[PDB]
């Protein structure tokens, strides 16, 4: 099935392949850790998983949610180091959309603008292409919410619920069986379903000391980090 | 075989083989713990003598980076040198840009990024340094941060590098550092790097310890003499 | 225990090797063996086995009952220098 | 062995091999040796020739007159790296008109030195100075070697068959901290006749001699004026 | 099966310049010897066939108006060095406005020798060192000098020397006849003896060329016509 | 900018790339080459016509100067390229000193590009060897011969190519001062030295001769049946 | 930084280039696609499929404009689509400015396929992995072509590419002539897309385009769903 | 030792067959393709037993042919992969030169390919004679055709000069197979002569295809 | 980065170099072009490859490609190289004419662009051009002239010549029936076509499977025309009956 430098370098194999993207991809369930991101009528929520095994860490900087613009928000997956890297980037090609341009960027344009810098890395043979996820959210004028995801092979695309990491494909499943249903969709229904779709993926009944959320809505849309307490309150509320 | 030769290629079952080399390469290194009180940090390193030739005071492993800030190395002396150089350089140079001390959440983000721009190309091979940052400032208490070769940095209540780092942090959580002023914090320092390193695997040895927060008014320097030669002499009852 | 390593004559061997492989066939009184060790600088113990049978042969070729320095030369001049696109010893130095 | 052709490639025990071969091919010069007295520093230097009919290669070179260096290695090198010193002295003494501090030069040959083992197809330097000096806080005396690593140290010596003098010089340790000039090189000479077999000492054609003091500029001798220094030794005791 | 340009031996060694260094065996022999009365040269050409013109080839050219050369090994890459010593001492005259001495362009030559590199520069020598030895002979303000070349940059002054593929032989030999009174006769006749010795073909008037040196004259070439009468007194 | 070596030493102390030109030069067509007092006389043979060619564009002997003709043997790709930059380089020197160019400067120069191009980076050897004749001021005619390693001589008579070994041993025992006497007998002397070798059979061989006086003068398919049927009555009236 | 600067496709012993086979491979293993002329315009048709309902069909398009009056359509490789778009964008654009009038077709697909055949000669790069197909209208005549990876190009009256495309072009062979309108070719479209499609065809998995001389645009779903029905 | 290399088709097998008829010592032959057996350890079995054979009889010859057929064609037949052909070489080897005392045998080797097989397969002392066959020349040329047209009721009109430069470089093979097909030819149309035409169309059928 | 390359520039051990020899081998099969002049005019005769039944037939050319207002040529193999290296010589001509006012000789221009195919065999590290392709034109200094190309790099005028799969037919037919000087644009289209009837494996010779372009001299014109598909048929059946009527005379 290999001939030749394939298995070594982004070059075509005979059936029309090339491995060293897609070891990428087996590449990012190295962290072992799930988020998920659900958008309702009016509203869009990011929830993902934390775990500190040692006392001596310092707890409050361990977040994998960064504040890319005061609209736009992201969630990132896989190696640290490449995803600061990619943070890097975002926030510094928003800042030049919104010097040259004069007014806010839109998610699509930045999704995209981000996998075609991405594309490059499995076009040339010296470079290895940053095994890392992105997941953005944000609010545009006459759209209400949008969901984007983007991969490390250069395939970004819009979607309205979405899981990245271990333990994708069950809860894509559970997700789908939920959506099928079509009900209406509220802030707190919609937070209730993305907790409760971790919560039965992993089977933990967690505390409120172990889960990060975010949240953009149409009254605010300052991307914003909810804080312990009314975390506490959502998860109380959910169980009655 | 031939996956791991280049720092551009991901093996079969998707990671890279060059950068846990450099890793294995760090796990050779004597040791150096560092901690965090009440009002600054401590930082302590255990210094083997080869032979008797060689003079006190030489190669000191406990660098000093700029007025404010201080790094404790461990791994490769050539390859830390070269860190400690362009850290320096970039404090500089943001003091000249903007006009103020550097705080420490982005001088160790600057050179964390600089030290992962080194683990993609194939041209260049991975630094094999890992090292710590800490300083004390009023607005702001103490910092620590902990920087390895593969380009991950993260914040401590203390931490400890070398071959007997697990060991070292065993006696290390038994503290209850969260309270005491770092007065009497030298006195368990000497005795937590006494009680470690039996005298089997090495006949003599010294001690090298840092000092940085309010007591000396936000410079970092060389503890006093005596202060060590007390701190020493109490560490020298763990025999009982 | 023991890791004998066996190299390429410098000088003296090719001399000495020379000597004992000619020293049982009629040759001329006044051949000197020195110039023809000159001659050739990297060489093994086959080669100089296989110049020898081959002056042999020169000499055999025409009529003669003892050969002369022109045929070592002819030999010298044929077997070492026209057989070299045909040799092993550029890739085993390197024991490759 | 694929893990021996590069200086990028990292052993799977994390140790590359191309450093190590550089430090193999430095030990085969000839040796040396240097050490430091209260007020002066002294080395010494064994010299080598190929044939009786040629001269012996010279060892000992003049950086500046507070400054002197001895090598170890291949030629080449040491001539490049002695005259970007002498280049880097000269620009100190001109920008801020005083003597470059011993620290400092070596800080920046460390530095210099450490470039070449990370890019591709590049190779280290193969040399082995041992530097003398003189400065505000007195004598001084460094070692680099090809790892770009840099020590400080009282007394050493490399080269080939370098270890029976650093027994001599480690037993011998405590009495260099008051003597003078006199009996230093007299003990330098001594630890530098140890690393000889029986048949063979000193003829004052082999051997070179450095010094650098407070008040005394840097000085070489060679092979004339050593015989006051060389005469007052006792004989290798059997 | 492929290594770089440059690359460390486990031994200590480099890879190249070995190869370069055993590489001169191929080449013809020349002597140089040192008296205080002044410097000889002497080399062989090895004719190959009876329709050369014996007056083409040559070896010993003079740098100089007191500096002459001898080369052994490879000739096609002596030129670049030769015209380097040349355009050298030029220039050091034009500024300093004197003559320089013979070991300041020993060294001055030598520190080209190992810069060939296969990375991070421009194209200069791509890869080969140098495959030339060079025997330097001169008088300059201390008298007669000769200096002695090789292709790792080693230079160091000798008193007696012979390089190229009968270089042992004649090394051993010329250890016993030679002492420091000497004079250039018989330093000449000695050289004439060995090459005699040595050399393959029949010696004669052509086959040969000798050059002496002297602090009173420049750098003097025997012709077709002196060189006899050393010969038919040998 | 490909920048990677190409020749290198081998570990017994050869540079096998130069070889291999070498041994791709030997397997060219055949060339020859005489000089006389006043006429220099060199030739070509394996014309193989194959009756669809125009002849006026395979030549294999050009003019440098008007004192000066090269013949080349090896792969002629890399001939043209040598004969430009050697034209372009031989008519500068006009510009600078008055005189016209010797044959041994531009024999030089070209020895020298062609062993400079052994040293630089990423650049294959060059695969051809020359014999470049000329009568230069003075009235001195010579010849010279250029190798793919640059390394130039001077001789009295040369073969290059394809069987050359065979030529030089018939002209190192034939060529004597009466057989140089008369130019018609040099030119004999060619000819038979050609007829000698590859069959070549009297179509097969393209001369051309400088009497040291003017430009070339490259002789039709007539005089050379002439010369040919000369030699062969010769020869049968001695057997 | 530096690259390589060596090729990486090299002639066979054989005398093959064998990255273009591999390419073409890769091509052929793509979404199918169809395209058709009859006298008045051009209709290029594709079939697109979202794995799952999560997927937002109306975020991405297949069938992108470069300018008022060309179209272009892909079978392949994804992200190798985008660049190629936009060079295109952007060497229209340099046409426009320097003449002053909307680009020829045939301008257009010349300097495209001579940007793809570049792009396989230079060192340290692979081919890209795409077929393209390209529509316009320009002086009354419609214009249809296809690009090669290997930088070839071709002009056809009926096209099919992608999976089972000898079947497409056997069918199209039975089925096509020259006269013709454009509904009917949008039915006989979607009639040999019916060949490999799915199950059920509904009117969002399934792209269309049309080009006449009043210039390019792309059919809304509703137009699509009434072409669907009253058909098959 | 001899070994006998050059381009396909020029009489190599030829000369073999002629020492062959000559010969008085027994003569053993083998090809290099079944060298190569399909289970694990047959292939130094197999040449043990051949050199025990050729040693037990007599003075004798020992001709091996394509020696090279072992190194360029692989088969899936074959239960190793590519190192049970070393330890094939390796077997060989040893028999040419091991130090056992050899006694008194000969052996020829052939083969077009020679820039692939193993130099120390071929180091003096195994093999001290190398022969290269050049491609033929016209005067070669014109004696294989008087040869092969010796006993054939040739006409008068045909000429061998035009059929010498019929092809640049035809090789030894190409004059038998043009003389025996035109010699079919004609005795399709039961004939006893050989015209022009039969030798025009004859090469045109061999040569162009 | 050493282990990846592929060394596309050095020698061999047996004297020769690789690639080009891949190359020509490469050349051999994908198309049949042959060349022929004798009098006024000469002609080019090419084999269509893509003859599938969806074709558009645009462009008024297959193969045949102008160079300037007296140069055409033809070529064979990979045809995105071909391409290339038409525009590469068509801005030589130009800038030729640009700075001499005058109509550029053909010699000189072959000469420069086999100058260039030659550059990338010698440094450079990069596959070669895998293209050979033929000149025909009319100058002042030699009246019409006809050349071939190679990938190597060399080239040479000619008479009659062909480069296809099957040249080494079409040669040996060519230099045993041809005529030095008498030949004039009337017979020349009958050699044509019967060379390519016995090239071909197909019979009956269907005019849309071939293409043929002349070159004829004018007063001051020197035009050039490709001739419509409404003339090969009768040449066709011509040639078809004349042979049929000698082959019934035997
Ligand atoms: N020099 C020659 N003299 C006579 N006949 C020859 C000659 N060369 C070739 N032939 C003819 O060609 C035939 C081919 O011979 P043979 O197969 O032995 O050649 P080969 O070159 O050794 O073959 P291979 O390389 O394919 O093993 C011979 O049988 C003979 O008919
Ligand atoms: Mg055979």
Not at chain 8, 92 to 116: P, Y
Request: hydrophobic share 40%; with cysteine.
């Amino acid at each position: 099935s290999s001939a030749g430098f394939d298995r070594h370098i982004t070059i075509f194999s005979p059936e029309g392949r090339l491995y060293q993207v897609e070891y990428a991809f087996k590449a990012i369930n190295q962290g072992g850790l799930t988020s998920v991101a659900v958008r309702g009528k009016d509203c869009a929520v990011i929830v993902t998983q934390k775990k500190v095994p040692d006392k001596l860490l310092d707890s409050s900087t361990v977040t994998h949610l960064f504040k890319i613009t005061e609209n736009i928000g992201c969630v990132m997956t896989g190696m640290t180091a490449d995803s600061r890297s990619q943070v890097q980037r975002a926030r510094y090609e928003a800042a030049n959309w919104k010097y040259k341009y004069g007014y806010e960027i839109p998610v699509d344009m930045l999704c995209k603008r981000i996998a075609d810098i991405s594309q490059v890395y499995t076009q040339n043979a010296e470079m290895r292409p940053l095994g890392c996820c992105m997941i953005l959210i944000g609010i545009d004028e006459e759209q209400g919410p949008q969901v984007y995801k983007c991969d490390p092979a250069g395939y970004y695309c819009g979607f309205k619920a979405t899981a990245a990491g271990v333990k994708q494909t069950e809860s894509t499943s559970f997700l789908e069986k939920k959506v099928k249903k079509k009900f209406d969709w509220t802030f707190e229904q919609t937070v209730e379903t993305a907790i409760t779709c971790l919560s039965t993926v992993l089977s933990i009944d967690f505390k409120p000391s172990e889960i990060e959320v975010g949240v953009v809505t149409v009254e605010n849309p300052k991307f914003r980090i909810l804080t312990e307490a009314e975390i506490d309150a959502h998860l109380v509320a959910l169980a009655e | 075989t031939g996956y791991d030769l280049s720092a551009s290629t991901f093996s079969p079952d998707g990671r890279v083989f060059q950068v846990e080399y450099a890793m294995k390469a760090v796990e050779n290194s004597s040791t150096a713990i560092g901690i965090r009180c009440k009002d600054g940090v401590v930082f302590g390193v255990e210094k083997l003598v080869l032979s008797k030739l060689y003079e006190e005071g030489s190669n000191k492993r406990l660098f000093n980076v700029d007025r404010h800030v201080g790094m404790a190395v461990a791994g490769l002396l050539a390859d830390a040198r070269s860190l400690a150089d362009i850290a320096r350089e970039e404090a500089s140079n943001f003091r000249s840009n903007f006009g103020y001390n550097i705080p420490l959440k982005h001088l160790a983000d600057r050179v964390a990024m600089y030290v992962h721009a080194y683990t993609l190309y194939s041209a260049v091979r991975p630094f094999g340094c890992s090292f710590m940052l800490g300083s004390y400032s009023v607005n702001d208490g103490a910092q620590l941060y902990m920087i390895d070769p593969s380009g991950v940095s993260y914040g401590y209540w203390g931490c400890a590098i070398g071959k007997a780092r697990q060991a070292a942090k065993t006696e290390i959580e038994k503290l209850q550092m969260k309270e005491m002023t770092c007065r009497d914090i030298v006195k368990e320092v000497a005795k937590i790097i006494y009680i470690v390193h039996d005298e089997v695997k090495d006949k003599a040895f010294e001690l090298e310890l840092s000092w940085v927060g309010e007591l000396t008014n936000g410079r970092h320097e060389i503890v006093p003499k005596d202060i060590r030669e007390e701190a020493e002499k109490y560490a020298k009852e763990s025999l009982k | 225990d023991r890791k004998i390593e066996f190299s390429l004559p410098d000088l003296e061997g090719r001399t000495h090797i020379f000597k004992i492989h000619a020293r049982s066939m009629s040759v001329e009184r006044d051949i000197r063996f020195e110039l023809l060790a000159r001659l050739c600088p990297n060489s093994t113990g086959a080669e100089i086995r296989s110049v020898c049978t081959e002056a042999g042969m020169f000499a055999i070729r025409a009529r003669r009952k003892i050969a002369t320095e022109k045929d070592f030369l002819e030999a010298v001049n044929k077997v070492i220098k026209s057989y070299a696109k045909f040799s092993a010893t550029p890739r085993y130095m390197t024991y490759n | 062995n694929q893990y021996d052709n590069d200086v990028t490639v990292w052993s799977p025990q994390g140790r590359i091999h191309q450093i190590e071969y550089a430090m193999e091919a430095v030990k085969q010069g000839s040796a040396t040796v240097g050490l430091k007295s209260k007020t002066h520093a002294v080395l010494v230097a064994l010299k080598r020739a190929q044939s009786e009919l040629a001269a012996h290669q010279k060892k000992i070179l003049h950086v500046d007159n507070h400054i002197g260096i001895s090598i170890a290695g291949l030629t080449a090198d040491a001539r490049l790296l002695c005259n970007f010193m002498r280049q880097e002295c000269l620009d100190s003494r001109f920008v801020f008109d005083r003597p470059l501090p011993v620290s400092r030069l070596v800080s920046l040959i460390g530095s210099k030195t450490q470039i070449p083992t990370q890019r591709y197809g590049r190779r280290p330097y193969g040399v082995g100075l041992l530097i003398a000096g003189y400065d505000d806080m007195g004598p001084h005396i460094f070692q680099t070697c090809p790892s770009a690593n840099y020590f400080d140290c009282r007394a050493m010596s490399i080269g080939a068959r370098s270890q029976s003098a650093r027994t001599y010089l480690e037993r011998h340790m405590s009495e260099f901290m008051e003597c003078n000039l006199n009996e230093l090189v007299k003990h330098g000479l001594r630890a530098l006749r140890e690393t000889l077999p029986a048949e063979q000492d000193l003829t004052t054609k082999n051997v070179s001699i450095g010094i650098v003091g407070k008040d005394l500029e840097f000085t070489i001798y060679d092979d004339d004026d050593v015989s006051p220094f060389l005469e007052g030794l006792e004989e290798r005791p059997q | 099966y492929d290594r770089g340009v440059n690359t460390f031996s486990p031994e200590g060694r480099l890879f190249q310049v070995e190869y370069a260094i055993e590489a001169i065996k191929l080449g013809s022999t020349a002597i140089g010897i040192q008296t205080s009365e002044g410097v000889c040269l002497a080399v062989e050409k090895r004719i190959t066939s009876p329709l050369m013109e014996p007056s083409s080839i040559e070896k010993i050219v003079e740098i100089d108006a007191h500096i002459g050369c001898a080369m052994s090994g490879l000739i096609a890459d002596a030129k670049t060095l030769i015209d380097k010593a040349r355009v050298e001492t030029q220039n050091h005259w034009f500024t300093y406005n004197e003559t320089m001495t013979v070991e300041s362009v020993t060294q001055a030559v030598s520190n080209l020798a190992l810069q060939f590199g296969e990375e991070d520069a421009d194209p200069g020598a791509m890869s080969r060192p140098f495959g030339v030895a060079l025997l330097f002979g001169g008088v300059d303000e201390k008298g007669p000098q000769l200096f002695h070349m090789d292709p790792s940059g080693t230079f160091v002054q000798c008193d007696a020397r012979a390089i190229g593929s009968a270089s042992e032989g004649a090394q051993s030999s010329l250890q016993e006849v030679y002492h420091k009174s000497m004079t250039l006769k018989e330093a000449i006749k000695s050289s004439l003896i060995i090459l005699k010795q040595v050399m393959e073909e029949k010696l004669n008037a052509t086959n040969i060329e000798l050059a002496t040196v002297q602090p009173g004259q420049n750098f003097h070439m025997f012709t077709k016509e002196e060189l006899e009468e050393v010969i038919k007194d040998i | 900018s490909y920048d990677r070596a190409i020749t290198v030493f081998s570990p017994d102390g050869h540079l096998f790339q130069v070889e291999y030109a070498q041994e791709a030069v030997k397997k060219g067509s055949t060339a020859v080459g005489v000089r006389g007092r006043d006429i220099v006389v060199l030739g070509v043979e394996k014309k193989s016509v194959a009756k669809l060619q125009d002849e006026r564009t395979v030549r294999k002997i050009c003019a440098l100067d008007d004192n000066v003709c090269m013949a080349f043997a090896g792969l002629t790709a890399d001939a043209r390229i040598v004969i430009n930059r050697a034209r372009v380089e031989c008519q500068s020197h006009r510009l600078t000193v008055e005189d016209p160019v010797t044959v041994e400067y531009i024999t030089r120069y070209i020895a020298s590009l062609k062993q400079r191009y052994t040293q630089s980076n990423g650049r294959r050897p060059f695969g051809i060897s020359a014999l470049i004749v000329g009568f230069d001021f003075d009235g001195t005619p010579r010849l010279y011969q250029t190798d793919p390693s640059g390394t130039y001589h001077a001789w009295k008579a040369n073969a290059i190519g394809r069987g050359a070994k065979s030529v030089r041993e018939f002209l190192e025992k034939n060529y004597t001062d009466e057989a140089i006497e008369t130019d018609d007998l040099t030119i004999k002397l060619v000819i038979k030295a050609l007829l000698e070798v590859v069959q070549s059979g009297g179509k097969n061989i393209e001369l051309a001769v400088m009497r040291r006086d003017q430009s070339l003068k490259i002789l039709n398919p007539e005089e050379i049946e002439k010369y040919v049927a000369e030699i062969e009555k010769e020869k049968e009236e001695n057997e | 930084e530096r690259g390589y600067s060596f090729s990486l496709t090299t002639f066979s012993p054989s005398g093959k280039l064998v990255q273009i086979e591999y390419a073409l491979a890769a091509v052929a293993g793509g979404a199918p696609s169809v395209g058709i002329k009859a006298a008045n315009g051009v209709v290029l048709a594709t079939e697109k499929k979202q794995k799952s309902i999560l997927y937002d069909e109306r975020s991405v398009h297949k069938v992108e404009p470069i300018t008022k009056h060309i179209g272009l359509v892909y079978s392949g490789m994804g992200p190798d689509y985008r660049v190629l778009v936009h060079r295109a964008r952007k060497l229209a654009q340099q046409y426009y400015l320097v003449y002053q009038e909307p680009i020829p077709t045939a301008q257009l697909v010349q300097r495209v396929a001579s940007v793809m055949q570049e792009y396989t000669q230079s060192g340290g790069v692979r081919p890209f992995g795409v077929s393209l197909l390209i529509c316009g209208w320009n002086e009354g005549r419609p214009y249809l072509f296809q690009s090669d990876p290997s930088g070839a190009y071709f002009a056809w009256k009926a096209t099919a590419m992608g999976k089972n495309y000898v079947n497409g072009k056997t069918f199209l062979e039975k089925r096509y002539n020259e006269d013709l309108e454009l509904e009917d070719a949008i039915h006989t479209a979607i009639l040999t897309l019916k060949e490999s499609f799915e199950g059920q065809m509904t009117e969002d998995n399934i792209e269309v385009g049309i080009c006449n001389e009043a210039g390019f645009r792309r059919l809304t779903p509703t137009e699509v769903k009434d072409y669907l029905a009253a058909i098959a | 030792g001899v070994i006998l290399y050059g381009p396909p088709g020029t009489g190599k097998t030829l000369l073999a067959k002629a020492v062959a008829n000559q010969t008085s010592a027994t003569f053993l032959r083998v090809v290099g393709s079944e060298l190569i057996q399909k289970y694990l350890g047959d292939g130094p079995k197999l040449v043990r037993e051949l050199f025990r054979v050729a040693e037990e009889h007599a003075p004798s010859i020992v001709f091996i042919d394509e020696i090279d057929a072992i190194g360029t064609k692989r088969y899936d037949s074959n239960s190793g992969g590519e190192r049970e052909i070393q330890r094939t070489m390796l077997e060989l080897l040893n028999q040419l030169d091991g130090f056992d005392s050899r006694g008194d045998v000969k052996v020829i080797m052939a083969t077009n390919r020679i820039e692939t097989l193993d130099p120390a397969l071929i180091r003096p002392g195994r093999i001290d004679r190398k022969i290269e066959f050049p491609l033929p020349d016209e005067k070669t040329k014109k004696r294989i055709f008087q040869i092969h047209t010796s006993r054939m009721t040739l006409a008068d009109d045909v000429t061998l000069d035009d059929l010498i430069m019929a092809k640049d470089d035809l090789s030894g093979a190409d004059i038998k197979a043009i003389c025996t097909e035109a010699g079919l030819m004609a005795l399709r149309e039961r004939r006893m002569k050989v015209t022009n035409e039969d030798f025009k169309k004859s090469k045109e059928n061999v040569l162009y295809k | 980065s050493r282990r990846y390359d592929s060394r596309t520039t050095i020698f061999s051990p047996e004297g020769r170099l690789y690639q080009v020899e891949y190359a020509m081998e490469a050349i051999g099969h994908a198309g049949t072009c042959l060349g022929i002049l004798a009098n006024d005019g000469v002609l080019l005769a090419a084999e269509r490859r893509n003859i599938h039944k969806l074709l558009d037939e645009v462009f008024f050319s297959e193969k045949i490609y102008k160079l300037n207002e007296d140069m055409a040529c033809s070529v064979a193999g990979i045809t995105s190289d071909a391409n290339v290296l038409t525009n590469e010589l068509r801005l030589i001509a130009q800038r030729y004419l640009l700075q001499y006012q005058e109509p550029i000789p053909c010699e000189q221009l072959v000469t420069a662009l086999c100058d260039i195919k030659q550059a990338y065999t010698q440094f450079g590290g990069k596959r070669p051009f895998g293209v050979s392709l033929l000149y025909i034109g009319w100058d002042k200094h030699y009246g019409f002239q006809l050349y071939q190309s190679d990938p190597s790099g060399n080239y040479g005028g000619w008479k009659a010549t062909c480069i296809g799969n099957n040249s080494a037919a079409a040669v040996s037919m060519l230099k045993q029936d041809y005529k030095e000087g008498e030949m004039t644009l009337k017979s020349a289209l009958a050699l044509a076509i019967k060379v390519l009837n016995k090239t071909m494996d197909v019979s009956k010779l269907s005019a849309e499977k071939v293409e043929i372009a002349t070159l004829t001299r004018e007063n001051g014109k020197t035009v050039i025309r490709v001739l419509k598909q409404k003339e090969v048929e009768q040449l066709i059946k011509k040639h078809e009956e004349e042979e049929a009527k000698a082959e019934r005379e035997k």
